C-alpha cells in the first residue's frame, strides 16, 4: 500500500558538559535503517537494515557529511534560539527536526513534511502546500521571514517531490522482502480474576508489522471506549509490535464481550471471545 520515509533529528545542549549531543535516525515506515550519534567514538552514519548495506562507500560518505553539517548547524541554531527567547546560557535545551515524504501504492507523492520543535513545542512547519509556513510564535516568525527571503520552501519542495520519493522507491524495491510484507497480529484473550464480583478480560495482539492497529472491546455490540484500558503500541525488539486492550467485566458476563482487531496484515477484521 502506502509508504513513508522520515529523518528524525535531536540536538540537546548540555552547558558545562561539552557541545550539544546530536542523534539522528532514518525510517522507512516503521523500520529503522540509518543512525548517527555525535557521541559515538568515531561518528559515521551506520546501516541498521540489511537492504541499505548494499549502498556504496560514496553513499555513506555523503550521508556522514550531511549528518556532521546538521550537527553543526543545530549548534548555531541552539545559540540563536537562546537569543530569540531571551534565555540564559546555563540551561539544557532541545531542538528537533523531522522531514520526509509519504507515497501512495503507485509510488506518487501523497505529501511531504519538514517541521521543527524547540524544547518539545512546535516551532515552525512547512505547510502541506510545500510553499508556505506555519510559525508557532513571534520567535518562529523571525525564522519564517529569513526562510521566505531565502526561498527555503522552494528548495524543500524540490527535494521532497524529487529525491525523497525516488530514494524511497529505491529502498522499497531493495527491501521488498520486509518493507512490503505485513505480519498479522497473533491474537488471544486472557482472563484475570480480580474479586468474587469481577475479572479482567485482556485482548492481546502480538508479533505484528507495521505498528498501526486497532484493538477495541464491545459489550452487547457497543464500543467500550471509556471503560477500555488500551496500552501504547510497543516494540518487541524483533521488528514487530505488541498491544493489548483490557476491560473489567462482571462475573458471568464474559460472553457479552467481544474483542475486535483490525490490521493491514488481516484480510478481514477479527472478532475474539474469552474461551475458558
Amino acid at each position: 500500500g502506502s509508504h513513508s520515509m522520515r529523518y528524525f533529528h535531536t540536538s540537546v545542549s548540555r552547558p558545562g558538559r561539552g557541545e550539544p549531543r546530536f542523534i539522528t535516525v532514518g525510517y522507512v515506515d516503521d523500520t529503522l535503517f540509518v543512525r548517527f550519534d555525535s557521541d559515538a567514538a568515531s561518528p559515521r552514519e551506520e546501516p541498521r537494515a540489511p537492504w541499505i548495506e548494499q549502498e556504496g562507500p560514496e553513499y555513506w560518505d555523503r550521508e556522514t557529511q550531511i549528518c556532521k553539517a546538521k550537527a553543526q548547524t543545530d549548534r548555531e541554531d541552539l545559540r540563536t534560539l537562546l537569543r530569540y527567547y531571551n534565555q540564559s546560557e546555563a540551561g539544557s535545551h532541545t531542538l528537533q527536526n523531522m522531514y520526509g515524504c509519504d507515497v501512495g501504492p503507485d509510488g506518487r507523492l501523497l505529501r511531504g513534511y519538514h517541521q521543527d520543535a524547540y524544547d518539545g513545542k512546535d516551532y515552525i512547519a512547512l505547510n502541506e502546500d510545500l510553499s508556505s509556513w506555519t510559525a508557532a510564535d513571534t520567535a518562529a516568525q523571525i525564522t519564517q521571514r529569513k526562510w521566505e527571503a531565502a526561498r527555503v520552501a522552494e528548495q524543500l519542495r524540490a527535494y521532497l517531490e524529487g529525491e525523497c520519493v525516488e530514494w524511497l522507491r529505491r529502498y522499497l524495491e531493495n527491501g521488498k522482502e520486509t518493507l512490503q510484507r505485513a505480519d498479522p497480529p497473533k491474537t488471544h484473550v486472557t482472563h484475570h480474576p480480580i474479586s468474587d464480583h469481577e475479572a479482567t478480560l485482556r485482548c492481546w495482539a502480538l508479533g505484528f508489522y507495521p505498528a498501526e492497529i486497532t484493538l477495541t472491546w464491545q459489550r452487547d455490540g457497543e464500543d467500550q471506549t471509556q471503560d477500555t484500558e488500551l496500552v501504547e503500541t510497543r516494540p518487541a525488539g524483533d521488528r514487530t509490535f505488541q498491544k493489548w486492550a483490557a476491560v473489567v467485566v462482571p462475573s458471568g458476563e464474559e460472553q457479552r464481550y467481544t474483542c475486535h482487531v483490525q490490521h493491514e496484515g488481516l484480510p478481514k477484521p477479527l472478532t475474539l471471545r474469552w474461551e475458558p
Binding site: 529523518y7 555523503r62 553539517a69 546538521k70 548547524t73 529569513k146 531565502a150
Partner: peptide
C-alpha cells in the same frame, strides 16, 4: 537519502 541543503533558524 538525506537532503543536501540546509539553513539556519
Amino acid at each position: 537519502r538525506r537532503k543536501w541543503r540546509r539553513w539556519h533558524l
